């Protein structure tokens, strides 16, 4: 009959608020041997590894295009990037003229038109003396003025160059993300999850899995895979999507290298501050290249077309992107301190219709040293050379398609790095536990 | 034995007769007691630079707040809110310790009990929170019965 | 080398169970509200401030609900009863319809417009009770 208010404390409910996460450490047997960009020693340890409780009978709406874990992770990867370059050496004594002529010399016969020694008057540690100093420079990192012509660097017009400290590593060590007390991360375990909509299999976790901060355009490297078949995710089905997230099931093992035994010299430009140049290449100068196995790239690219039919009925033409700048036109990645730029015009050549395995696809890769990271202007960065030969061997675990007759065309994507982080952070969000609940029962406070 | 931690060394029969000494230094004399933390704030206002000793006073305050609230919460989940010796309905399982009362209360200190029972307290705390939760449910619908 | 032993109740494990058997696990969520994974077994890093901000936030939210319990008559308790009669314009549902049939997070999305009105009436009847318990001690 008479019902009364009774309040409960410890109630399992949650809103969908957003907050400040923090990182955790993943089994690093270094324990401060070297330092890297990502400052992974500053993360917390955990004596149990992070866990996962299966929650029964609950459904929950996710939305991978309005998840704020991606925008929070994007501001953190830039923040950790700028923390490391700030104590490194400012490199203003290279804004001078660069008088040089191509290189000198069974035959080498390659790299004659993409690389040249350039001599210049540097500063010494006395600010009264000059030193005549040569250095090898890539053709991309030089600009004509007006045989031995006069050159200058790219962003000496627009920026202030700082080189990277060579002890700091660019290796993407995995980072977890953890929630403070009173918060939770809910992940979707359902295999047929298309990015948005509800989810009948949710579980809560202490921390996420290991996300590797791999920076790449047009392709996804060293990521996660798919359980079932190839999932394809766009924003909204309204013919204005323009970006497609393809997630593969089996990888396509890129192997990629630059063959050259180049050296590295140390050149003092002030009180202790040293410029690390490129001395000489020992042996035969070659191009840089990535190999793609033509067998299973043809297999993997075909399965993408099979699942694009379920969204779109038009015929499929994979055409390479055409743009001005070299960053969103090529495939940029990183091998231990070298920034490659690979022409993927042959991986995206063919057209497809509603209806080979001997060779290997070989891609021509350029390489440069002055880098405008994170689509910012004014804060260029000089990557020092690495002695010897380098070799990478990574996995294509997905790819990014930008959309531009009745025959639709998917150019290769690139540009924004937030699309790299929606590939990984799509399957979980942050909630906020509210312990006070209130409900009517038949018990009233027995007074005095 | 009177004095802070002076009963460390006596047996736990006599070390538990003077528990007020510890539950006053750890409830009163931690945050309420000091007013000289806001006498060092204006001296930090005179200098225009954040010093090293200003960071360490954050970390010694946030450790002082959390150490106070993570022992009052745990006494709040149980029925032992504002008191120092409280009894529960949890029967003592002899696989936690088979040891007799005369050996425990009269030939063993509290600091020798820390180094014996510490593997078991996470199991013991689960059974105090569960039986407190079963009690308040039972005294609600009993209340609503009459 | 580890292995899963026996299992007990876990955090949020009664979410979406029901409303009457999810109130038998109130201590399981109330244990995980103050201390998290932040507390384990050199200065001003990006990950250092972001860890310290998570510790100041976790005290401010805990003290918010713990204040609000003591303003009511319900301090140090998990289920307490008030003298505020339930008003059917807040919700008209039956007694066997919210217990044994409804879960929390379905009842949360139902009365979340009325909680600010409900909270005011619990605080008002606590002032009226404590004045009367004072004025009963004058005899």
């Amino acid at each position, epitope marked *: 009959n008479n019902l009364w208010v009774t309040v409960y404390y410890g109630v399992p409910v949650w809103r969908d608020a957003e907050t400040t996460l923090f990182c955790a450490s993943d089994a690093k047997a270094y324990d401060t041997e070297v330092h890297n960009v990502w400052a992974t020693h500053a993360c917390v340890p955990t004596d149990p590894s992070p866990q996962e409780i299966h929650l029964a009978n609950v459904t929950e709406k996710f939305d991978m295009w309005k998840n704020s874990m991606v925008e929070q992770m994007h501001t953190d990867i830039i923040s950790l990037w700028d923390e490391s370059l700030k104590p490194c050496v400012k490199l203003t004594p290279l804004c001078i003229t660069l008088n040089c002529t191509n290189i000198t010399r069974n035959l080498t016969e390659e790299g004659k038109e993409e690389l040249k020694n350039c001599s210049f008057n540097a500063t010494t540690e006395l600010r009264d003396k000059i030193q005549k100093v040569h250095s090898l420079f890539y053709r991309l990192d030089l600009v004509e003025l007006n045989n031995t012509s006069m050159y200058r660097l790219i962003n000496c017009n627009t920026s202030a160059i700082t080189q990277a400290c060579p002890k700091v590593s660019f290796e993407p060590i995995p980072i977890h993300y953890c929630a403070p007390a009173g918060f939770a991360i809910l992940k979707c375990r359902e295999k047929e999850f298309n990015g948005t909509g509800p989810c009948k299999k949710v579980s809560t976790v202490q921390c996420t899995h290991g996300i590797k901060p791999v920076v790449s355009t047009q392709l996804l490297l060293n990521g996660s895979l798919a359980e079932g078949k190839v999932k394809i995710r766009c924003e909204n089905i309204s013919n204005n999507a323009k970006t497609i997230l393809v997630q593969l099931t089996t990888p396509v093992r890129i192997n990629c290298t630059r063959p050259s035994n180049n050296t590295r010299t140390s050149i003092r430009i002030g009180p202790g501050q040293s410029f690390y140049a490129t001395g000489d290449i020992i042996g035969d100068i070659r191009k840089a290249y990535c190999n793609v196995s033509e067998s299973e790239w043809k297999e993997a690219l075909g399965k993408v077309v099979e699942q694009l039919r379920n969204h779109f009925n038009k015929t499929i033409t994979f055409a390479s992107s055409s743009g001005g700048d070299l960053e969103i036109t090529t495939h940029s990645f990183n091998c231990g301190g070298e920034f490659f730029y690979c022409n993927t015009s042959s991986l995206f050549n063919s057209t497809w219709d509603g209806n080979v395995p001997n060779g290997t696809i070989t891609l021509p890769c350029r390489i440069k040293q002055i880098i405008n990271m994170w689509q910012r202007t004014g804060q260029a960065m000089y990557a020092p050379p690495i002695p010897g030969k380098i070799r990478c061997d990574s996995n294509i675990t997905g790819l990014i398609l930008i959309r531009d007759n009745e025959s639709e065309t998917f150019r290769p994507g690139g540009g924004d790095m937030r699309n790299n982080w929606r590939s990984e952070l799509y399957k979980y969000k942050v909630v906020k536990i509210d312990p006070l609940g209130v409900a009517p029962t038949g018990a009233k406070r027995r007074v005095v | 034995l009177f004095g802070f931690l002076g009963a460390a060394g006596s047996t736990m029969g006599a070390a538990s007769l003077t528990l007020t000494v510890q539950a006053r230094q750890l409830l009163s004399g931690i945050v309420q007691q000091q007013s000289n933390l806001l006498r060092a704030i204006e001296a930090q206002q005179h200098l225009l630079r954040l010093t090293v000793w200003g960071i360490k006073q954050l970390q010694a305050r946030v450790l002082a707040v959390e150490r106070y609230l993570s022992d009052q919460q745990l006494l709040g989940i149980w029925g032992c809110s504002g008191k120092l010796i409280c009894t529960t309905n949890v029967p003592w399982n002899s696989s936690w310790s088979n040891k007799s009362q005369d050996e425990i209360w009269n030939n063993m200190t509290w600091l020798q009990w820390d180094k014996e029972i510490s593997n078991y307290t996470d199991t013991i705390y689960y059974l105090i929170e569960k039986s407190q939760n079963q009690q308040e449910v039972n005294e609600k619908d009993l209340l609503a019965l009459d | 080398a580890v292995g*899963i032993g026996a299992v007990l109740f876990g955090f949020l494990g009664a979410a979406g169970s029901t409303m009457g058997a999810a109130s038998l696990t109130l201590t399981v969520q109330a244990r995980q509200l103050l201390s998290g994974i932040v507390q384990q077994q050199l200065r001003l890093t990006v990950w250092g401030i972001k860890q310290l901000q998570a510790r100041v936030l976790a005290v401010e939210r805990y003290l918010s609900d713990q204040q609000l319990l003591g303003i009511w008559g319900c301090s140090g308790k998990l289920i307490c009863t008030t003298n505020v009669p339930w008003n059917s314009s807040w919700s008209n549902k039956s007694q066997d319809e919210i217990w044994n049939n409804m879960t929390w997070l379905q009842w949360d999305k139902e009365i979340s417009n009325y909680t600010d009105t409900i909270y005011y009436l619990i605080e008002k009847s606590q002032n009226q009770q404590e004045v009367n318990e004072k004025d009963l001690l004058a005899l």
Partner: antibody
Amino acid sequence: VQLVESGGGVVQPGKSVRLSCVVSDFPFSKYPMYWVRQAPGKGLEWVAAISGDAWHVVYSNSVQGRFLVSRDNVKNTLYLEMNSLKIEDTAVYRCARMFQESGPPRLDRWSGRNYYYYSGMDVWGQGTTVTVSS
Amino acid sequence: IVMTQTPLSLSVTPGQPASISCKSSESLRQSNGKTSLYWYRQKPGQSPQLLVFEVSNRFSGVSDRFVGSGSGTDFTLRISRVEAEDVGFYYCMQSKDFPLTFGGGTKVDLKR
């Protein structure tokens, strides 16, 4: 310390044996025990592992659903059953002991689970054998 | 977790130190911070015998000639001044996760 075995012999395919491993002067409720397997002219393998709690037992992948490990903390014994014996199990079966005692199960509060801890070896047994034949 | 060793057999001189290395696929650093590498010894027709029960520390009853090293996945075992009690079979064991796998196994011999 001394670790004594028995119970080994010669059987047919499709039979059941019962090995045994009696210990000497342990607490033995603190130490979880093992079973390794060495084929003739081969390297060592791992078969099974029971805890000192006698509650959580694990098996190898090849021997799953066929074996049964138990123990009696009063009698200080190990009781390895076997069922549906194949031909490739002709080897030597050694019981073993971890070099330190695992403690109690450690309750994790966030998920409500108990965890056991496993590590290496001190004392292999004498070494008894089972040879299956026709 | 797989295990591979170099070499499969040694042929050394008494009084000359040698070394045997093990290689793991996954890193064996547990969440305790301590690794899970174990160095064993089986004489022919004999029960096995522990020698080094971490990266570094030596079993109670083993002479100081056996030193251990390594971190991550690369590990070694450097015998100092090989003698007549140092022949037989040497094993690597992980205890990071089940199943508790053993290594391949070396056969240390002299030159008769």
